[PDB]
Design an enzyme around this catalytic site. Sequence first.
Site, PDB file in Angstrom:
ATOM      1  N   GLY A  16       1.206  -1.390   0.329  1.00 11.00           N
ATOM      2  CA  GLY A  16       0.131  -0.145   0.160  1.00 11.00           C
ATOM      3  C   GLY A  16       0.454   0.801   0.156  1.00 11.00           C
ATOM      4  N   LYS A  17       0.252   2.100  -0.332  1.00  9.39           N
ATOM      5  CA  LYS A  17       1.078   3.351  -0.910  1.00  9.39           C
ATOM      6  C   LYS A  17       0.005   4.862  -0.027  1.00  9.39           C
ATOM      7  N   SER A  19       3.703   4.806   3.577  1.00 12.67           N
ATOM      8  CA  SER A  19       3.932   3.585   2.660  1.00 12.67           C
ATOM      9  C   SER A  19       3.769   2.218   3.505  1.00 12.67           C
ATOM     10  CB  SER A  19       4.693   3.512   1.330  1.00 12.67           C
ATOM     11  OG  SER A  19       5.970   2.928   1.266  1.00 12.67           O
ATOM     12  N   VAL A  20       3.580   0.942   2.981  1.00  7.78           N
ATOM     13  CA  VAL A  20       3.811  -0.479   3.209  1.00  7.78           C
ATOM     14  C   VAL A  20       3.998  -1.479   2.372  1.00  7.78           C
ATOM     15  CG1 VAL A  20       2.871  -2.513   4.677  1.00  7.78           C
ATOM     16  CG2 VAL A  20       1.689   0.067   5.020  1.00  7.78           C
ATOM     17  N   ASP A 127     -10.085   5.832  11.939  1.00  7.20           N
ATOM     18  CA  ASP A 127     -10.473   5.710  10.789  1.00  7.20           C
ATOM     19  C   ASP A 127     -10.481   4.119  10.690  1.00  7.20           C
ATOM     20  OD1 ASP A 127     -10.073   5.165   7.594  1.00  7.20           O
ATOM     21  OD2 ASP A 127      -8.387   5.745   7.783  1.00  7.20           O
TER      22      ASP A 127
HETATM   23  C1  LIG Z   1      -0.437  -0.981  -4.159  1.00  4.76           C
HETATM   24  N1  LIG Z   1      -0.919  -1.679  -4.270  1.00  4.76           N
HETATM   25  C2  LIG Z   1      -0.765  -2.734  -3.621  1.00  4.76           C
HETATM   26  C3  LIG Z   1      -0.592  -4.326  -4.226  1.00  4.76           C
HETATM   27  C4  LIG Z   1      -2.061  -3.906  -3.339  1.00  4.76           C
HETATM   28  N2  LIG Z   1      -2.548  -4.420  -2.004  1.00  4.76           N
HETATM   29  C5  LIG Z   1      -2.246  -6.308  -1.435  1.00  4.76           C
HETATM   30  O1  LIG Z   1      -2.683  -6.913  -2.677  1.00  4.76           O
HETATM   31  C6  LIG Z   1      -2.005  -6.932   0.267  1.00  4.76           C
HETATM   32  C7  LIG Z   1      -1.456  -7.397   0.314  1.00  4.76           C
HETATM   33  C8  LIG Z   1      -1.369  -8.036   1.614  1.00  4.76           C
HETATM   34  C9  LIG Z   1      -1.986  -6.860   2.468  1.00  4.76           C
HETATM   35  N3  LIG Z   1      -1.311  -7.382   3.552  1.00  4.76           N
HETATM   36  C10 LIG Z   1      -0.869  -6.686   4.796  1.00  4.76           C
HETATM   37  C11 LIG Z   1      -0.893  -5.247   4.546  1.00  4.76           C
HETATM   38  C12 LIG Z   1      -0.190  -4.615   5.985  1.00  4.76           C
HETATM   39  N4  LIG Z   1      -1.152  -3.035   5.885  1.00  4.76           N
HETATM   40  C13 LIG Z   1      -1.279  -2.398   4.814  1.00  4.76           C
HETATM   41  C14 LIG Z   1      -2.648  -2.411   4.521  1.00  4.76           C
HETATM   42  C15 LIG Z   1      -3.515  -2.408   6.016  1.00  4.76           C
HETATM   43  C16 LIG Z   1      -4.547  -2.741   5.600  1.00  4.76           C
HETATM   44  C17 LIG Z   1      -5.751  -2.612   4.610  1.00  4.76           C
HETATM   45  C18 LIG Z   1      -4.386  -2.284   3.501  1.00  4.76           C
HETATM   46  C19 LIG Z   1      -2.955  -2.241   3.514  1.00  4.76           C
HETATM   47  C20 LIG Z   1      -0.360  -5.244   7.030  1.00  4.76           C
HETATM   48  C21 LIG Z   1       0.105  -4.225   8.549  1.00  4.76           C
HETATM   49  N5  LIG Z   1       0.847  -4.643   9.220  1.00  4.76           N
HETATM   50  O2  LIG Z   1      -0.994  -3.351   9.076  1.00  4.76           O
HETATM   51  C22 LIG Z   1      -0.176  -6.853   7.023  1.00  4.76           C
HETATM   52  N6  LIG Z   1      -0.268  -7.095   5.993  1.00  4.76           N
HETATM   53  C23 LIG Z   1      -2.432  -5.857   2.215  1.00  4.76           C
HETATM   54  C24 LIG Z   1      -2.990  -5.464   0.779  1.00  4.76           C
HETATM   55  C25 LIG Z   1      -3.135  -3.176  -3.580  1.00  4.76           C
HETATM   56  C26 LIG Z   1      -2.744  -1.585  -3.283  1.00  4.76           C
END
Ligand SMILES: CN1CCC(NC(=O)c2ccc(Nc3cc(NCc4ccccc4)c(C(N)=O)cn3)cc2)CC1
Length: 271
Positions: A16-17, A19-20, A127
């Site tokens: 995500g951005k 960013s993560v 949020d």
């Molecule tokens: C750019 N594009 C990249 C590809 C897509 N993304 C994913 O397919 C995805 C896959 C696995 C994911 N797993 C995560 C995300 C986390 N934080 C980030 C997050 C928090 C809430 C909701 C979404 C994301 C955390 C955490 N420990 O906080 C743990 N696990 C989150 C998304 C769409 C965006």
Amino acid sequence: PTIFEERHLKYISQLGKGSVELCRYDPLGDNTGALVAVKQLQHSGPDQQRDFQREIQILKALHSDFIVKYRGVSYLRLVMEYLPSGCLRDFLQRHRARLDASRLLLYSSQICKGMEYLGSRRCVHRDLAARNILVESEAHVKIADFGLAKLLPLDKDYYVVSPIFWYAPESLSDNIFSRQSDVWSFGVVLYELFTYCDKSCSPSAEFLRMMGSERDVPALSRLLELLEEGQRLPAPPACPAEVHELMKLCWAPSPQDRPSFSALGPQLDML
Ligand SMILES: CN1CCC(NC(=O)c2ccc(Nc3cc(NCc4ccccc4)c(C(N)=O)cn3)cc2)CC1
């Protein structure tokens, strides 16, 4: 200090951005390392940075099976657990046909148990939306993004300080946030769950429709006028009437008349 050394955090992809990103924490260099989610700030603006140190200490302190686990730090980068299935909003719209009302009730009950714990820790998420809920597996969800989270003052039950379509009328009008403003947000989450996050009837798409054709009239003003009238998000199609009733309670105009998460929990579980 034993940290997640930068040289050992092997980048894989973006989640995500700030960013993560998904990294493999490989201190042994043998590619046998664990996959962790790593959070960092990109255009490091002085106010967003102090907010990051608050966030790290909050997540570090929380211990629920329904809240993402804190793992550590790198250096500033926040290391956390990785939930592979992704965002609950994506998961509902991708697997809508396989998920029944009983499974949505399991998620509602898990978010509820998560939020109940948060309250006992005198923390307000601010949020709470399906976009910030993650999927562990088809039978387990966890709450994420404590980026906006605020701790309640040691003597007060409220806190005065963007996601307006999940915001309660007191949040909208006077910037007041409490556990009860998160109950209002929980009511919007139930709406998202039971509409399977359909883009067509999203809380965003639905309120804009209600606000009308007067775009120069501030959103905060038009939205508050609507919520004072008693206008709400409709009953989701095919949604159990018992659930849409709990939604309406979460949407009581006064924060004192909204049920607590402690009260909602059994009501969800016993359907
Ligand atoms: C750019 N594009 C990249 C590809 C897509 N993304 C994913 O397919 C995805 C896959 C696995 C994911 N797993 C995560 C995300 C986390 N934080 C980030 C997050 C928090 C809430 C909701 C979404 C994301 C955390 C955490 N420990 O906080 C743990 N696990 C989150 C998304 C769409 C965006």
